[PDB]
């Protein structure tokens, strides 16, 4: 049912994403956001997969969507910052990495992936 439908796209999309088939894994997690739309993981993995095929325009939106279902998902912010970085919205990516450190007061990705925003 509508619960197990959300795991089906998790396992099936994950087994594609870890195999390097990010494009195939997107179409999996897509079914779950349309079946449930309440787990922040489904949009977070679709965002990561889009970010692995340099679709930062699509991965910005799916990172935002994961933050709308959770609000406390520090990874969904760091992922959004990595999208907005290579999208040219570098200063918007900073506003996302500065958040990751509120939710994780030692995050090495939030210190490092943010340092790229500030460099020449």
């Amino acid at each position: 049912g509508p619960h197990m439908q959300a795991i089906s796209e998790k396992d099936r999309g994950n087994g594609f994403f870890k195999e390097g088939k990010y494009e195939r894994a997107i179409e999996c997690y897509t079914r779950g956001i349309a079946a449930d739309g309440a787990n922040a993981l489904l949009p977070a993995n679709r965002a990561m997969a889009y970010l692995k095929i340099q679709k930062y325009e699509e991965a910005e939106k799916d990172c935002t969507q994961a933050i709308l279902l959770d609000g406390s998902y520090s990874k969904a912010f760091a992922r959004r910052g990595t999208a907005r970085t290579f999208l040219g919205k570098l200063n918007e990516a900073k506003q996302d990495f500065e958040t990751v450190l509120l939710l994780e007061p030692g995050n090495k990705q939030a210190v490092t992936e943010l340092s790229k925003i500030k460099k020449k």
């Binding site: 998790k10 999309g13 994950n14 994403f17 870890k18 993981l41 977070a44 993995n45 990561m48 990874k75 760091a78 992922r79 990595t82 994780e104 995050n107 990705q109």
Partner: peptide, 9 residues
């Protein structure tokens, strides 16, 4: 590997 962002949940 660890509490990292590029791993899927």
């Amino acid at each position: 590997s660890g509490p990292t962002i590029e791993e899927v949940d």
